[PDB]
Amino acid sequence: GSFLGFNTHFNRNGAWSPESAVAFIADSSRVKIGVRQDITVKFLDQATLGTG
Amino acid sequence: GSFLGFNTHFNRNGAWSPESAVAFIADSSRVKIGVRQDITVKFLDQATLGTG
Numbered sequence: 140g141s142f143l144g145f146n147t148h149f150n151r152n153g154a155w156s157p158e159s160a161v162a163f164i165a166d167s168s169r170v171k172i173g174v175r176q177d178i179t180v181k182f183l184d185q186a187t188l189g190t191g
Numbered sequence: 192g193s194f195l196g197f198n199t200h201f202n203r204n205g206a207w208s209p210e211s212a213v214a215f216i217a218d219s220s221r222v223k224i225g226v227r228q229d230i231t232v233k234f235l236d237q238a239t240l241g242t243g
Binding site for chain 2: 185191
């Protein structure tokens, strides 16, 4: 195995598009993901979904 | 009165259809009513009822 010097991450959630790319190589210091609100759950028992 | 031996139940909630029957006679051991949930009440205060 010979990708030493890369931190390697494997997509497992089905987001990968194999027709578009095999891999991305990046300087990770220059990519940032802002988390404004993490995944939150609200139980609905009275709401209306859609119209008409 | 001559309805001898029978346990008599008189219907009074208006479900009776006098055009269909005078009486049913049954072996009551052979009828079962399944109760999955007896009458329960929910207080609604945000819901929408109906459409248009």
